[PDB]
Each structure stands twice: as structure tokens, then as C-alpha cells.
Design a protein around this ligand. Structure first.
Ligand SMILES: NC(=O)c1ccc[n+]([C@@H]2O[C@H](COP(=O)([O-])OP(=O)(O)OC[C@H]3O[C@@H](n4cnc5c(N)ncnc54)[C@H](OP(=O)(O)O)[C@@H]3O)[C@@H](O)[C@H]2O)c1
Ligand SMILES: NC(=O)c1ccc[n+]([C@@H]2O[C@H](COP(=O)([O-])OP(=O)(O)OC[C@H]3O[C@@H](n4cnc5c(N)ncnc54)[C@H](OP(=O)(O)O)[C@@H]3O)[C@@H](O)[C@H]2O)c1
Ligand SMILES: NC(=O)c1ccc[n+]([C@@H]2O[C@H](COP(=O)([O-])OP(=O)(O)OC[C@H]3O[C@@H](n4cnc5c(N)ncnc54)[C@H](OP(=O)(O)O)[C@@H]3O)[C@@H](O)[C@H]2O)c1
Ligand SMILES: CC[C@]1(C/C=C2/CCCc3cc(OC)ccc32)C(=O)CC[C@@H]1O
Ligand SMILES: CC[C@]1(C/C=C2\CCCc3cc(OC)ccc32)C(=O)CC[C@@H]1O
Lengths: 235, 248, 239, 236
């Protein structure tokens, strides 16, 4: 506890899976968390599971006007952002032969386009010395059947952590990417066979790695790709 | 010669790296289709190449232009041995400056158009063919005001991995080339003055171990390696052609 | 606060710099620490700075018999090892033209040879589920003038984290490499503000900052992290 | 007449596998080649298979006095070096628990120590603008059971290509690493082919062709890289 004491965190995709596990860990570490998603019922249930120091905000990150509304609320309730975890994303499998323009747009709108504007519109509220975490994926460095657009989109996310390291260094804002392997979320058994640790990861394990990047334990860590995959991409 | 009687399609082939590659390919015995949007430059490029070339006007962001392109290739040559997906463009904008229109322009040409260029080439691509994607050193660097371009070129490199896996049954190799600073009309188009362009150039030469910008013919020669049988056991890679910039 | 509660840690090169800063953090998190080095007075002064739950062990990690002695002491006093931080290393600058066999041998003996046998001889004591941290360097992915053998040796260190991930997975032992950038340690003046200019964060790192990253890898917070290279360099190698 | 016309190339480990395959391709491209190895009969059969424009040199590259002899022969017969392919290496499998000091010393002496001094002593003869190719391995980026010392040594080899890029840039000498995957040579069943997208082991001639790219002027703007020649094994 106390490892994020009194810090204000915004987590997109915070109503399920990894974002929710991270929201819980952040609150346990003393932070106040805004969880962001499109479904209000799931946001309300997630916020109830978190139990304290949480505000749920309905927002589609692909809509600029929803991001403006999100940050107006953050400005009303807390006034600034210390930690931003841009975790909203979705995987849809299509082979190259199968790719449609709509499939391409759905993948890049949420994973890249919405991520760019999520971070852009947080800049006025981000405090100097803050920490931004981007969700990439092991897919960003692999050649996975039928993951064409998702893998390419997550590779784009990792690149943005590099560029934003350079652009935000004057404000001492650190930007790092986390690249999860197989995590037991709503997003089968071969992932456990291909991973040295021999199992899929738990969402709490990804939350703990994101906590490292959000916390002062990583104060000299900038621009990296932190693989949290039980060794999958490393051997 | 090293591409004797091979059929090559080069998008962005009317200038810079694509044109130098077209010239080298024809010099190695290939028949080349050069593809671009500008008719004056396509005709002059085809005239400079001089032989074994068909210029095709096509905007890779328009699906119907890609259909027409591959109808022309099917009629004139019947199949594709080498596909060099080289069309792309850089516009400098910082994170604060990014507009939806800037983002869309960058990813439409660098990623969307690249995906459908390769997708629509699949029926004509021969088993054992070679596909080369143009990424960039920007795809592994953190360059001021290159947010969308660098991210887009990282996406391009990822696709070489995915398509290696998906096309392995047809023995089609897919590889990415990542140029450093190459002396083309593109280095001068992203800046607003030629006092800036000479700064960007001698800065690139100073950060590169070989101490100079690359010549377009040098990138063409690396693309030739990936197109030729010399790379028959090379698949999914990122070939940096940058004078050592990203390697030290 | 107690993230290494009841854990036994062995830190080679714990006499000073990163190893010493890591030893302090480990003890603050509840571990019992063995610090290992060649100089006894400096070990005693370091252990006094640590203040509690520490045993200093004199050992030259390049000498197989000193490693045997080290682990015999660990076996009597604590019985097992939970965390191994192999931090012994040294930089000597020589250009390719300048390299002698002795310069080559000294660099790889401490950086690679001594590390291999430090880990080999810890295996009988390493508990299932333990964590091993190897010290690589940003030099392992760079082309730095006159760092020929040091950079190559640190690249070898990072490779071993991969191989040992595969070999030790049946025992659920995680092996990870930390790759420090410029850290303000006794490894020195004015080349420091040279490194600070090349780093996005605009500064050299503090040893406590590297210690915090090693703690992450040692702690259960990194329980799904295996085989990685964790760059702690203010962005130097990442942009 | 060709891509290496009248160029002088030195290939260590040139009496078998990739070394020999590369020597043959280099000669086919117009080069004069020195092949280097320890065994006289096999160097002698290697030179006979190449057939022309080749000098066999008996030398243990881990012995500094043999390297001096090697480069004296190169200077006398050809006068300078355009391409250096430092290809000597060997795999011995030992797990961490099994590693002995003798095993470690043998692995690093051939793969790293001998490689360093091979390149060091070639420096006086290397032409400005020359090309140096180092043999790394896919093992240098993988976690392969019982490959502890070999993988670490090949990782060291790839690192040296970066450092020497920086140190030799004033002479415009390019240094690049080639990292072979599974290549069908006497140094070695379906497991390698099953993990590789191209679905087969590589032919020695295929690695030779990749080394030729790095040796030839086609790679004149390529420096410090790791060229994977592995059918996609490490790339997907
Ligand atoms: N699980 C894995 O193995 C894995 C591996 C690599 C990367 N990731 C990435 O981790 C992140 C979270 O995924 P997950 O594993 O936790 O599965 P998940 O439970 O499905 O999480 C998806 C989250 O993103 C939200 N979301 C999706 N689209 C959104 C949109 N336009 N606007 C706002 N919110 C949106 C979702 O809430 P709403 O639908 O209500 O909006 C939800 O909270 C993603 O970026 C994912 O690609 C996961
Ligand atoms: N230092 C470098 O030069 C460098 C570095 C990294 C990557 N690259 C990449 O190398 C590739 C070649 O660019 P270049 O350096 O040689 O400059 P360039 O070719 O002179 O300019 C871009 C080329 O792509 C074509 N193009 C642009 N948009 C197109 C579209 N919708 N459809 C069809 N063609 C299009 C252009 O032809 P039209 O305008 O007539 O259509 C032109 O031929 C690019 O992808 C570039 O990003 C270059
Ligand atoms: N500082 C940086 O910027 C930086 C950057 C990259 C990597 N690193 C790595 O980080 C590690 C920690 O070094 P440091 O920077 O903190 O310097 P340091 O610890 O101040 O000096 C090296 C330490 O290793 C010990 N050591 C050296 N040879 C030994 C041997 N044969 N047996 C036992 N112990 C030995 C030394 O103690 P004794 O001499 O008393 O034995 C000393 O405590 C090193 O491996 C270094 O290569 C540091
Ligand atoms: C197209 C511009 C680009 C940029 C590279 C440099 C040269 C290397 C260092 C560098 C630092 C920068 O920060 C402001 C910006 C640019 C740069 C080129 O030269 C060609 C491709 C690459 O995209
Ligand atoms: C020697 C200290 C060390 C390497 C120094 C650098 C890294 C930064 C760039 C640099 C440029 C130089 O001039 C040619 C010389 C050295 C250097 C660091 O600090 C990081 C690891 C390693 O211990």
C-alpha cells in the first residue's frame, strides 16, 4: 500500500480484465482512479468491486467528444492526472485474405487512433513527473496467424511510447509500454504450452507490472517495452 | 541476370527509392510495373527506365485503383514474382498538433493502402515469390514530431512477420526494409526551407556511422537482395539500410 | 514494505554501488542479504551501513573455490536462497587495435565466466519459485568506442538470462537481466554530464533507482516476467 | 566481370559447411579466396572442390602466431583484403549444471577470443571501404536448452559488429553479423523445420548468398546489422 498514495490515475478500459485488476491494485496503493469504458452497467459494477476512491466515466475513446467530456470530469473532481494507463483495445482475428476496410478501421480506431487522442487530451492535466503506460502486446513482435491488424496496431502503440518519451521529456513525464502475453481475461491451452512459465498470466500479475511503471520504483525507466508473458517472446 | 524474366510490381515507383529500384530491377532483367498517382512523373520515370516497364496510375488508398492495377498486371504478364510495397509519406506533427485528418492521411497511405496492395496481389503472386515492405528506422526510434509516421512504419514491420506466417504455405517470403536517411526528394519535403533541409541532412550524416546520407541506388540494391534468390532463406526480417544509425 | 519477507538474497558486488544500494532496499523489504566482494573492510563498512539482517562474505567470484566457500556459508546460516543478484562486473576500455589477451581474459572472466559459476553453484540452494537477476548493460545493445570486450560480455550476460529461463522453468525459477544506463556509481567526474545529455530524462540514474528495478524483478510483483532485458537507462537505448 | 571481381576475400572456417559454400560462391563471383582451417587434408579437398582462385591456409585462428602467418600469406599473394568472413565456430551442448571451466574456455576461445584477434590482425591489410562479416547465430537471441555458452558467445559476436562499426567508421569499413538458423551442414530433425515458417532447414548455399550480399557493394549502406538467415524462425 501507499505506493501510489494520493496520485490521480485514469485507466481506459478499466471496467474489465487487466484495466479492472489494475484499478483495484492502484486503489490498494492509495490512488484515486477514474475507470473509463463504454458500458455503464459494467462500469458501475466494476466501481462497486473497487469499493472506494473510484469514479466511473462512460466514454468511447474513439470519439473525441467523449474524451473531452472525460477530462472535463477529471478536471472537476481531481484537477490533475499523475498516472495515465491507456488500456482500451480489442482483438478481432482476420487473415490477410479476410481483411475488410471496416475490420481495419475497428482495430486501428480503438488501438491507435483512440490511444493517440486519449494521451493528447490528457496533456493539459498531466503533472510534470507523471507516468503514462501504454498497452501493447506480445503480438507486436510476433507473426500470429490471423492477427494482422491487431499485431500491427500494437506495434504502433509501442512506437508511440518511444516518440512520446522524446516529446514529453521536458516535462519529466515517463512513457512506457507494457506488452502482455496470454492473460486470463475475457479477451486457448496452447498459450500455456508455448510459455516457459507453463501457464497463462493472471490479471493481477499484469496489474503488478503496470504498478511498477506507474510507481517511483521505475523512475529511471523510460520508453521501454515491458514484456509480461512468462518468457514467451524471450526464448 | 539476377531477376531474369521475373515480374515486379513497385508502388511509389515514379520517384526516389521506388524509381531507383525500378531501374535496378530492369537492369537485372525484370519486367517492372511502377505505380504512383502523378502522371507526369510516371511517364518521365518510365521514359528514364527506358524498357521493360509499364507505368500504372493508381492511388493505393483507392481499392478500385488497386483492382485496375492487378488487372493490368494479369493481362500484361500474368503473375507477380516480386512485390515492393513502397508508397508512403511523412508529415511532421507533435502529439499536441495531431489532428484526425493528419492521422488519417498518414495511416491511410502507410498502413491501410499497404495492406490492400498486398491483399489484392495475392491471386497473382507466384509460389516462392518475394514481398518487400518499406518500413523505416523511424519505426524503432523516438523522433520529435514523427508520432504517426513512426507508429505507422512500426505497423508495417509487424505485417512482414504476420504475412510470413500466413503465406508460408505458398513459400512466399515477406520482408521489411528500414531505410535510414536516403537522399531523395522526401528529406526536403518535410521541412519548410532548404537551410532546414541541409541541417536535417548534415545532422543525419553526423548521427550515422558511415557519416553520410544513403543514395537511392543503395536502398535499391538492398531491396534487390530481398527480391532475388540470394535471400531465399530470409523471411520476416527487418533489414536496416541506414549506415549503422540504429545499430550503434 | 515487506516485499521480500523471509527471503534469503545473495548479491555479488554488494560491497558498493548498485549491489550495495540493492542490498539496502532488500533489507528494507524484509530480506536477509549476503553481500559478496573481495575487500573485507569495505564489506564490513557496507554491512554496517545496511545495519541489520546482513552477512558479508569475502569471495572472488572468478575463483571456483571462493564460490564453494560462499555457498557453504549460505547453507549453514540460512539453508537456502530465494533471490540471486549477480552484480559483479567491471569496465576496462580498449579499442580493437589495443586489445590484448589479458584484457580480454579479465573482462570475460569477471563478467561471464564468474557469473556462470556464481549461478551454477547457487542451484543446489535455489528454492523453486526463486528469482535470479543478472546485470547486463545498455552497452550490450550499443556500439560504444573502446568498449569492445565489455559490451560483448554484457551481451553474453543477457543471452544467459534467456537460456536459464528455459533450463530452470521446471523449477519455476525466473531469470531476468537488468541493463543499467549511466548510474552514479564508483565506476568513474565530467563524462557523467556527457551521458546525461544523451539520455531523455536528462540525467544519470541513482543507484537506488536501479535497486528499485532489481527489487521489482526479485519481488512477486514480477511473477509473470521471465527472460527479459529490463532497461533502466532514462530512455537512452529506447529512442 | 561479377559482383566480387578481382576482390580478395579471407574466410576462416572455410574448409567445410557455410565457410566452403561461401568460398565457392565468392569464386563464382570473381573473387580470390583464402580459406582457413586447421586440417590439411580437408582444406586440400576444399580447395580442389573450389577449383580455382583459391589459396588454402593451415592456421588455428585461436593462435596469434598462426594469424600473423595467415596475413603474411595474404599480403604476399594478393596484397590487401576486401572481404573478411570470420566464420570459425563450434557448438557443444552442456546445461548450466554440466558446464565445466574447460567447456566454457573451449566455447569462448573459438567463438569470441579467436574472432577478436582474427579481425584485429586483419586491420593492416583491410582496404578502406572493405566489408567484414561475423558469424553469429539465432542462438544469440534464443533460450535453447543446453546451449548456454554457445548462445552467450554468439551474442558476444553480434555485439562486436556494433562496436567495430563505430571504431572502423573512419576507414569506411562495414562490419555486419549474419545469424544463421538451422543450416544443413556437417555441424548438425523435423523440429527445426517445424518451427521455421519456410518449413525446412537452410542449404549452405543460401547462407553463402546472404554473406555475399554483405560482402558485395549491394550492402554499401548496411552497417552494424544482424542479418537473420533462418527461414523466419526468430522473426515470427
Ligand atoms: N488479455 C491478453 O492476453 C492481452 C494481451 C495483449 C494485450 N492485451 C490488451 O490489454 C488491454 C485490455 O484488454 P483485456 O485483456 O483486459 O480484455 P477486456 O476485458 O476485454 O478489456 C477490454 C477493455 O477495453 C474497453 N474498451 C474496448 N473498446 C473501448 C472503446 N472504444 N472505448 C472505451 N473502452 C473500450 C472495454 O470496456 P467497454 O467495452 O465497456 O468500452 C474493456 O474495459 C487491451 O489493450 C488488450 O488488447 C490483452
Ligand atoms: N530517408 C528516406 O527517404 C526514407 C526513410 C525511411 C522510409 N522511407 C520510405 O521509402 C519509401 C519511398 O519514399 P522516398 O524516400 O523514395 O520518397 P518519394 O518516393 O519521392 O515520395 C513518396 C513516393 O511514394 C508515392 N506515393 C505517395 N503516396 C502514394 C499513394 N497514395 N499512392 C501511390 N503512390 C504514392 C509517391 O508517388 P506519387 O505522389 O506520384 O503518387 C512517391 O513515389 C516511403 O515509404 C518512405 O516513407 C524513406
Ligand atoms: N554503473 C553503471 O553505470 C553501470 C552501467 C552498466 C552496467 N553496470 C553494471 O552494474 C554492476 C554493478 O557495478 P557498479 O556500477 O555498482 O560498480 P561497483 O559495484 O561500484 O564496482 C563493482 C563491484 O563488483 C565487485 N566485484 C568486482 N569484481 C569482483 C570479483 N571478482 N568477485 C567479487 N566481487 C567483485 C566489487 O567489489 P570488490 O572489488 O570488493 O570485489 C564492486 O562491489 C556491474 O556489473 C556493472 O558492469 C553498471
Ligand atoms: C524523415 C526524417 C528522418 C529523420 C532522421 C533523423 C536523423 C537521425 C536523428 C534525428 C533526430 C530527430 O529529432 C528531431 C529528427 C530526425 C532525425 C530522416 O533523416 C530520414 C527518415 C527519418 O524519418
Ligand atoms: C562507460 C560507461 C557506460 C558507457 C558510456 C557511454 C554511454 C553513452 C554514450 C557514450 C559515448 C562515448 O563517446 C564515444 C563514450 C561512452 C559512452 C555508460 O555510461 C553506460 C554503460 C557503460 O558503463
Amino acid at each position: 500500500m501507499y505506493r501510489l498514495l494520493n496520485k490521480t490515475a485514469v485507466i481506459t478500459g478499466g471496467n474489465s480484465g487487466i484495466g479492472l485488476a489494475t484499478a483495484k491494485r492502484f486503489v490498494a496503493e492509495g490512488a484515486y482512479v477514474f475507470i473509463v469504458g463504454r458500458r455503464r452497467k459494467e462500469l458501475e459494477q466494476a466501481a462497486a468491486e473497487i469499493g472506494r476512491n473510484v469514479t466511473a466515466v462512460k466514454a468511447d475513446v474513439t470519439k473525441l467528444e467523449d474524451l473531452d467530456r472525460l477530462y472535463a470530469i477529471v478536471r472537476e473532481q481531481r484537477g490533475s492526472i499523475d498516472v495515465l494507463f491507456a488500456n482500451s483495445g480489442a482483438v478481432e482475428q482476420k487473415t490477410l485474405e479476410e481483411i475488410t476496410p471496416e475490420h481495419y478501421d475497428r482495430t486501428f480506431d480503438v488501438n491507435v487512433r483512440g490511444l493517440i487522442f486519449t494521451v493528447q487530451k490528457a496533456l493539459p492535466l498531466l503533472r510534470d513527473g507523471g507516468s503514462v503506460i501504454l498497452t501493447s502486446s506480445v503480438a507486436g513482435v510476433l507473426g500470429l496467424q490471423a492477427h494482422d491488424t491487431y499485431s500491427a496496431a500494437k506495434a504502433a502503440v509501442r512506437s508511440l511510447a518511444r516518440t512520446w518519451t522524446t516529446e514529453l521529456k521536458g516535462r519529466s513525464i515517463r512513457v512506457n509500454a507494457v506488452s502482455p502475453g496470454a492473460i486470463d481475461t475475457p479477451s486457448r491451452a496452447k498459450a500455456a504450452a508455448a510459455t516457459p512459465l507453463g501457464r497463462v498470466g493472471r490479471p493481477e500479475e499484469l496489474a503488478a507490472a503496470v504498478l511498477f511503471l506507474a510507481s517511483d520504483d521505475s523512475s529511471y525507466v523510460a520508453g521501454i517495452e515491458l514484456f509480461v508473458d512468462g518468457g514467451l517472446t524471450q526464448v
